[PDB]
Design a protein around this ligand. Structure first.
Ligand SMILES: Cc1cc2nc3c(=O)[nH]c(=O)nc-3n(C[C@H](O)[C@H](O)[C@H](O)COP(=O)(O)O)c2cc1C
Ligand SMILES: CC(=O)[C@H]1CC[C@H]2[C@@H]3CCC4=CC(=O)CC[C@]4(C)[C@H]3CC[C@]12C
Length: 362
């Protein structure tokens, strides 16, 4: 089956098209937002993936929106991630780091100085984030109303993405994935629903896409375009962030701009976990004719759907999320048509080994 055939993805070659989606698990050490040996073990268990895309990782301390999410900005974080990439490479895997700034999906209590988080504009996300209680357990909390970034703060954001990509190179990641989806900072600028700015970073689609394209250019210049992927969720609503009244045209504009940079891949998150409308094959064809790198699809895929769309030439790979949580050897299971392990969603976020490294292989 095409699912188990190789694929060139920028600077690396995936041996199969079964990718591990980025999956926030909120198990990092605080203080310091530091990856752990347990996280290293979890990723090593999944190293047969065509590509592992890490959990979303902070570009800076300001980027933090969830207690337990790791960073890639401090020396201690870099040191810990080096162990994780080494372990994946020891098993002949490939790993990309997903890099985010959460923007307004955050809480003042985990921001520098205990201050309001930042965004394109000053309106509340009307979403929940996850903090930790006094015993270290994950709890759901309402997001804090953000402050609009000043114009003079925007270059610093771009620089933080640049620096985090430099750090990713040092840490031995194979690729980086920019988190431009799911209502986080880059998507907050992209969407008219979250961006009411009247300067060069809001209004028109060109203005709304300006920040993400500055970030893409900065990180391509820092490392290489064949090391850079981007995740978008440009059709539908994700965590209360829609894509405005011209979502298809605006998506195609962004994709045409991304193509000019010659980046490694475009990762399309197709639906929110709470549901959304399917992509049409016509839209997939419009994306395909505008982007000349790898296209990854995600969002409640089955192997059957993946094989269908890869066979139709519309996408190149599929990222599985929850099936990868529950099946470290998902590749082997799909190749052999074996049953999958049951999921335990109660242990997706926070905690320890249970519901993390205790899902068995065949
Ligand atoms: C526990 C959990 C954590 C997730 N964390 C992230 C994340 O860090 N970054 C991201 O872009 N998407 C994240 N997602 C979305 C997944 O990458 C993926 O889009 C989602 O799993 C839908 O696909 P599925 O039906 O294969 O699980 C997460 C999803 C879940 C279930
Ligand atoms: C509603 C709620 O409990 C929050 C707390 C942690 C949140 C998740 C944290 C990780 C995450 C990252 C993404 O990019 C998509 C949304 C998700 C998957 C979030 C969905 C909403 C969650 C589950």
């Amino acid at each position: 089956e095409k699912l188990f055939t190789p694929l060139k993805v920028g600077a690396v070659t995936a041996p199969n098209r079964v990718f591990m989606a980025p999956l926030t698990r909120l198990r990092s050490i605080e203080p310091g937002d530091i990856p752990t040996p347990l996280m290293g073990e979890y990723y090593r268990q999944r190293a047969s993936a065509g590509l592992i895309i890490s959990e979303a990782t902070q570009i800076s301390a300001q980027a933090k929106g969830y207690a337990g999410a790791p960073g890639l900005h401090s020396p201690e974080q870099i040191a810990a991630w080096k162990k994780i990439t080494a372990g994946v490479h020891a098993e002949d895997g490939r790993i990309a780091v997903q890099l985010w700034h959460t923007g307004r999906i955050s809480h003042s209590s985990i921001q520098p100085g205990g201050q309001a988080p930042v965004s394109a504009s000053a309106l509340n996300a009307n979403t929940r984030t996850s903090l930790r209680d006094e015993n270290g357990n994950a709890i759901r909390v309402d997001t804090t109303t953000p402050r609009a970034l000043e114009l003079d703060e925007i270059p610093g954001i771009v620089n933080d993405f640049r620096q985090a990509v430099a750090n990713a190179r040092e840490a031995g990641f194979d690729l980086v994935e920019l988190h431009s989806a799911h209502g986080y900072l880059l998507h907050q600028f992209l969407s008219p629903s979250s961006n009411q700015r009247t300067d060069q970073y809001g209004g028109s689609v060109e203005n709304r896409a300006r920040l993400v394209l500055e970030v893409v250019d900065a990180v391509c210049n820092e490392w290489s375009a064949d090391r850079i992927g981007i995740r978008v969720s440009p059709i539908g609503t994700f965590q209360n962030v829609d894509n405005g009244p011209n979502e298809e045209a605006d998506a195609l504009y962004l994709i045409e701009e991304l193509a000019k940079r010659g980046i490694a891949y475009l990762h399309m998150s197709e639906t929110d976990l709470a549901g959304g409308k399917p992509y049409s094959e016509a839209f997939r064809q419009k994306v395909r004719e505008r982007f000349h790198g790898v296209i990854i699809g995600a969002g409640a895929y089955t192997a059957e759907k993946a094989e269908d769309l890869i066979g139709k030439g519309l996408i190149d790979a599929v990222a599985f999320g929850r099936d990868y949580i529950a099946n470290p050897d998902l590749v082997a299971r799909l190749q052999k048509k074996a049953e999958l392990n049951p999921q335990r969603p109660e242990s997706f976020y926070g905690g320890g080994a249970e519901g993390y490294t205790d899902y068995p292989s065949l």
